[PDB]
């Protein structure tokens, strides 16, 4: 189907402990590809999945390089934004920042991201026509300007259009076998008595990948949102993901109950009871 | 290269 | 400001006792990064605890996972003790095999 890449980065300081410590990690979709983490004892954009370890000795050369410079990039920007908030010298600060590229099925083009944070709010996102900017508040409308007078909108626009997307293709090419590969959920319904009228019917997905999954309840054909309780998706260390939906139910009404299954791996989406 | 060079906020 | 974690221990692979597995405790929704966990054995600190690089969802929440090999059996208590500055003091949860 349609494939994502993305660069997951954190930036955080940490007064009389040292310079801010600088972490990038990529993904494909739901597979992480690798990792530069600038507390490593020799820092280096380091492989974390089997197919991207064909790439030569320039791809992780390059890639280094560009990101011992992104942890230069970030400090700069940490002391940058602790001036813009008027902030002391004395407290830890966290910059994020997603960026990468949606592709079809045909690996064309869906669009492209690039957007930061501080402090865990939103503060400047290139806008979907990869032109201008989006600022929260009169900090970012600094940076704003500061990237409208460097024109640098007009680099992320050639990185993410040509760049990123060239190189989601080839990496969804050397790793077809996983990455266009989906892994439907296996699925079963437990039964909990919790006292004399009332037991807890629980419905299971495990074992599937992507992470992208619907999992409900319904009673008599109406769907229980208010009454479901719903985990969040969680990973199992093997590449998969597990997932639970649970309802409370009156004793002996548990055949008016059906859990719904949606996922890309499945033939057809399920209808389950339980037995 | 595949990385993104990036700028100060 | 802050955002404290989720928190769900549980199994890589449905759990038979006497069987090698792996035990997860994976932490979510949390922010500032900064975080302590820890698996625990019978209230003990499980020493070969490895974990996931750091990374975050798209509300900018981080998550991680802390894993490690274990062999469950009908005696043993296992759980996950996590410490981040939204906590007053640590939070347990036990490993519970149907959740």
Same mark, same amino acid.
Not at chain 1, 21 to 43: E, H, K, L, M, N
Not at chain 1, 242 to 265: D, F, I, L, N
């Given at each position: ?19 801010? $410590? ?47 410079? @992104? ?7 940490? $002391? ?5 908030? @008027? ?38 996102? &290139? @806008? ?22 460097? %024109? ?19 990496? &969804?090419? @050397? ?5 266009? %590969?989906?892994?439907?959920?296996? #699925?079963?319904? #437990?039964?909990? /008595? ?7 019917? %629980? ?31 969680? /990973?199992?260390?093997? $590449? ?28 057809? /989406?399920? #209808?389950?009871?339980?037995? | ?9 | ?99």
């Amino acid at each position: 189907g349609s494939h994502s890449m993305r660069y997951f980065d954190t930036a955080m300081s940490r007064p009389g402990r040292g310079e801010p $410590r600088f972490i990038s990690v990529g993904y494909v979709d739901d597979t992480q590809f690798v990792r530069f983490d600038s507390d490593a004892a020799s820092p280096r954009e380091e492989p974390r999945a089997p197919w991207i370890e064909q790439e030569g000795p320039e791809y992780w050369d390059r890639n280094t390089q560009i990101f011992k410079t @992104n942890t230069q990039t970030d400090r700069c920007s940490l $002391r940058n934004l602790r001036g813009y908030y @008027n902030q002391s010298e004395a407290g830890s600060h966290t910059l994020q920042s997603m960026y990468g590229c949606d592709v079809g099925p045909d690996g064309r083009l869906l669009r492209g991201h690039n957007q930061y944070a501080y402090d865990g709010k939103d503060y400047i996102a &290139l @806008n979907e026509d990869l032109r201008s900017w989006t600022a929260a508040d009169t900090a970012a409308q600094i940076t704003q300007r500061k990237w409208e007078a460097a %024109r640098v909108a007009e680099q992320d626009r050639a990185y993410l259009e040509g760049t990123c997307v060239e190189w989601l293709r080839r990496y &969804l090419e @050397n790793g077809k076998d996983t990455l266009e %590969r989906a892994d439907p959920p296996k #699925t079963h319904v #437990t039964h909990h /008595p919790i006292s004399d009228h009332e037991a807890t019917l %629980r419905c299971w997905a495990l074992g599937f990948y992507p992470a992208e999954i619907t999992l409900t309840w319904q009673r008599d054909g109406e769907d229980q949102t208010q009454d479901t309780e719903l985990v969040e998706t969680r /990973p199992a260390g093997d $590449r998969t993901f597990q997932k639970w939906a649970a309802v409370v139910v009156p004793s002996g009404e548990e055949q008016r109950y059906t859990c719904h299954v949606q996922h890309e791996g499945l033939p057809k /989406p399920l #209808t389950l009871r339980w037995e | 290269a595949a990385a993104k060079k990036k700028y100060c906020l | 400001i802050q955002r404290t974690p989720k928190i769900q221990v549980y199994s890589r692979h449905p759990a038979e006792n006497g069987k090698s597995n792996f035990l997860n405790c994976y932490v979510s929704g949390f922010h500032p990064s900064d975080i302590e966990v820890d698996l625990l054995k019978n209230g003990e600190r499980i020493e070969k605890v490895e974990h996931s690089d750091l990374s975050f969802s798209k509300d900018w929440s981080f998550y991680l996972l802390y894993y490690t090999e274990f062999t469950p059996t009908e005696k043993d208590e296992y759980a996950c003790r996590v410490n981040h500055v939204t906590l007053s003091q640590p939070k347990i949860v036990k490993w519970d095999r149907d959740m």
